[PDB]
Design an enzyme around this catalytic site. Sequence first.
Site, PDB file in Angstrom:
ATOM      1  N   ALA A 125      -4.944  31.754  66.654  1.00  0.00           N
ATOM      2  CA  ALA A 125      -6.042  31.574  67.594  1.00  0.00           C
ATOM      3  C   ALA A 125      -7.316  31.040  66.953  1.00  0.00           C
ATOM      4  O   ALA A 125      -7.731  31.490  65.885  1.00  0.00           O
ATOM      5  CB  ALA A 125      -6.326  32.872  68.329  1.00  0.00           C
ATOM      6  N   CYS A 126      -7.933  30.078  67.627  1.00  0.00           N
ATOM      7  CA  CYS A 126      -9.206  29.519  67.196  1.00  0.00           C
ATOM      8  C   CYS A 126      -9.998  29.004  68.387  1.00  0.00           C
ATOM      9  O   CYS A 126      -9.453  28.287  69.224  1.00  0.00           O
ATOM     10  CB  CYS A 126      -8.985  28.364  66.225  1.00  0.00           C
ATOM     11  SG  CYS A 126     -10.503  27.441  65.910  1.00  0.00           S
ATOM     12  N   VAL A 127     -11.277  29.361  68.468  1.00  0.00           N
ATOM     13  CA  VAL A 127     -12.131  28.819  69.520  1.00  0.00           C
ATOM     14  C   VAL A 127     -12.353  27.323  69.363  1.00  0.00           C
ATOM     15  O   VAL A 127     -12.373  26.589  70.348  1.00  0.00           O
ATOM     16  CB  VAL A 127     -13.520  29.507  69.602  1.00  0.00           C
ATOM     17  CG1 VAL A 127     -13.392  30.913  70.130  1.00  0.00           C
ATOM     18  CG2 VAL A 127     -14.232  29.490  68.240  1.00  0.00           C
ATOM     19  N   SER A 128     -12.525  26.867  68.126  1.00  0.00           N
ATOM     20  CA  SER A 128     -12.939  25.488  67.916  1.00  0.00           C
ATOM     21  C   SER A 128     -11.761  24.534  68.009  1.00  0.00           C
ATOM     22  O   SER A 128     -11.319  23.946  67.018  1.00  0.00           O
ATOM     23  CB  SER A 128     -13.718  25.301  66.607  1.00  0.00           C
ATOM     24  OG  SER A 128     -12.845  24.995  65.546  1.00  0.00           O
TER      25      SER A 128
END
Lengths: 113, 113
Positions: free
Chosen positions: B9-12
């Site tokens: 998981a990563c927001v960016s």
Amino acid sequence: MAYLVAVTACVSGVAHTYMAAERLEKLCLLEKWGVSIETQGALGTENRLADEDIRRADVALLITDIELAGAERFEHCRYVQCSIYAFLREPQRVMSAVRKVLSAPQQTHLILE
Amino acid sequence: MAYLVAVTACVSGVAHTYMAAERLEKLCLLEKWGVSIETQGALGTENRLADEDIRRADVALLITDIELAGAERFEHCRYVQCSIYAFLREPQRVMSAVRKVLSAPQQTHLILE
Ligand code: NI
């Protein structure tokens, strides 16, 4: 030499909570461990672990059948969680499980039963 | 013959997530581990883990900076959790942690770098 913090919890929380705590006090006696015990019952939180204790501690022990009030205080700690009726039944899984988590080079959360 | 489920998981965006999934997929086949990887990114959740997959997995790997949707699903799993840029900089640390959690007797959660 180790310092253990703990929380014992029972929904009703007057009888099943105090005998769990007392047992742990004499377990910590034997293994010569420092220990501070928080009690959560229907009479409320007693000897509430200050966050100084919790950060000074090497491992936490969560004996509960319940949604610990301020369970989040313990996310950054090595700990062992188990039910009330499980610690009372055979506790040297628990104290050994505590000494594993205490020894383990990693920061493990260990759930029993 | 061991089976691993994973969530990266990563927001960016969809760039820091797929290389994490990439490296793990080839970390796994090399060790001959079966593996299903859930992706959570700006494009949403892709190849979401079936819970039969999660319930028959021997261990889960949570590679995330952020708060996982359905973090709920792994509460009864042996798992290792770490941030993405940690899995990236040095991954062997992670899978040997995974192999301990796989090896160790009890349902241990391991938070790593
Ligand atoms: Ni946990």
